[PDB]
């Protein structure tokens, strides 16, 4: 019913995203958004009959400020994912006061996820603006630009179009499905 393709002609499998995940993520990281701090999570799930299903929203050990966040113990996250047979399907984070877009840091992070999994998505929540977005780099051209980039900045700019929202409709299909939040903090 959907057959999605990259800019480069590569087919993308469907990712089923629980309709409720965005709000649930906002609910779980509210104490942080309320204290003007970003939070990140990992979108975890499984492959069944050639489609991915996000089943677990994993909040890893991390540190944050008003305009950054980052993991601080990836070994534990690995242990958890490996024990429960959970794939990395993408990630999510808040812009508590900012607009909804992909920052330089976000694109650099995302590129690696998307090279490892062409379907990988980055969800950005901008709760002050009541907006949100689901994004990916252009493949191959945007992934190429980020791969070849080597500038410190780390809000540094990039040449050309690099990223895009996922198409509507496209490979990410929202559905009314269960979700487990795993808080590793």
């Amino acid at each position: 019913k959907i057959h999605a393709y990259t800019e480069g002609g590569k087919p993308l499998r469907t990712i089923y995203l629980p309709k409720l995940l965005k709000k649930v993520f906002l609910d779980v990281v509210k104490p942080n958004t309320k204290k003007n701090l970003e939070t990140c999570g990992i979108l975890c799930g499984k492959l069944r009959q050639n489609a991915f299903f996000i089943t677990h929203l994993v909040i890893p050990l991390q540190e944050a400020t008003s305009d950054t966040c980052g993991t601080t113990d990836e070994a534990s996250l690995f242990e958890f994912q490996d024990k429960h047979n959970l794939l990395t399907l993408g990630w999510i984070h808040t812009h508590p006061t900012q607009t909804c877009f992909m920052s330089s840091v976000d694109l650099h992070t995302h590129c690696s996820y998307q090279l490892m999994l062409p379907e990988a998505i980055a969800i950005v929540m901008a709760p002050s603006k009541n907006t949100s977005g689901i994004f990916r780099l252009l493949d191959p051209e945007g992934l190429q630009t980020i791969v070849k980039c080597r500038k410190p900045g780390l809000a540094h700019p990039h040449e050309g179009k690099v990223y895009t929202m996922v198409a509507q409709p496209g490979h990410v299909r929202e559905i009314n499905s269960k979700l487990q939040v795993v808080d590793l903090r």
Partner: protein
């Protein structure tokens, strides 16, 4: 020798290495081959997180050993 690097996305990366390569060298090879910067890479073997300055031989990593790659996350 060849080693394998398994991801959390169902992907396995094959690498050409020698026993005396450091972990730093290994992450550079991953960058060369796959486009992931070393600073985003965390490598794990036999339950331990590997250190840049030590060698494959130091961790007993041999012909056809499997390491695991887990990415950092940085957002803004």
């Amino acid at each position: 020798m060849q080693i394998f690097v398994k991801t959390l996305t169902g992907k396995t990366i094959t690498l050409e290495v020698e026993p005396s390569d450091t972990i730093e060298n290994v992450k550079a090879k991953i960058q060369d081959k796959e486009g992931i910067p070393p600073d985003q890479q965390r490598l794990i073997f036999a339950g331990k997180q590997l250190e840049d300055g030590r060698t494959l031989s130091d961790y007993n990593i041999q012909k056809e050993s499997t390491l695991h790659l887990v990415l950092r996350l940085r957002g803004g």
